[PDB]
């Protein structure tokens, strides 16, 4: 649709899937994650979108690794969404990948200053 993650708009399905299958075969202890700013977010940008993440990384650990790349100030709030839902704090990144990776074998996560996606 017209509301679609930007990475999927710029790379077609079969090309994405081929890279997802290859990187999962080459680095089976990590999971490929596409990280993008939510559309209506008022927040700093990330240098890159494509991350290889240890499966055993906690969600809270992942939050901090992205926060320090955005260079947020202490008073700046940060929220993450998988299919419009904030992940449970008890999840690992491998768990989110296993539950929610798309058919191209990427896991998509969005970040925002707001607590509701695209508010």
């Amino acid at each position: 649709g017209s509301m679609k993650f930007v990475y999927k708009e710029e790379h077609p399905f079969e090309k994405r899937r081929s890279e997802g299958e290859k990187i999962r075969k080459k680095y089976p202890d990590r999971v490929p994650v596409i990280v993008e700013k939510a559309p209506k977010a008022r927040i700093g940008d990330l240098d890159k979108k494509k991350y290889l993440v240890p499966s055993d990384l906690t969600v809270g650990q992942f939050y901090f690794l992205i926060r320090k790349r955005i260079h947020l100030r202490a008073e700046d709030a940060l929220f993450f969404f998988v299919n419009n839902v904030i992940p449970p704090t008890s999840a690992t990144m491998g768990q989110l990948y296993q539950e929610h990776h798309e058919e191209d074998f990427f896991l998509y996560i969005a970040y925002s200053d707001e607590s509701v996606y695209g508010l």
Partner: peptide
């Protein structure tokens, strides 16, 4: 060589 477009994350 397959990772020129991928950044690897880690925790100490």
């Amino acid at each position: 060589d397959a990772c020129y477009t991928w950044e690897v994350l880690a925790w100490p």
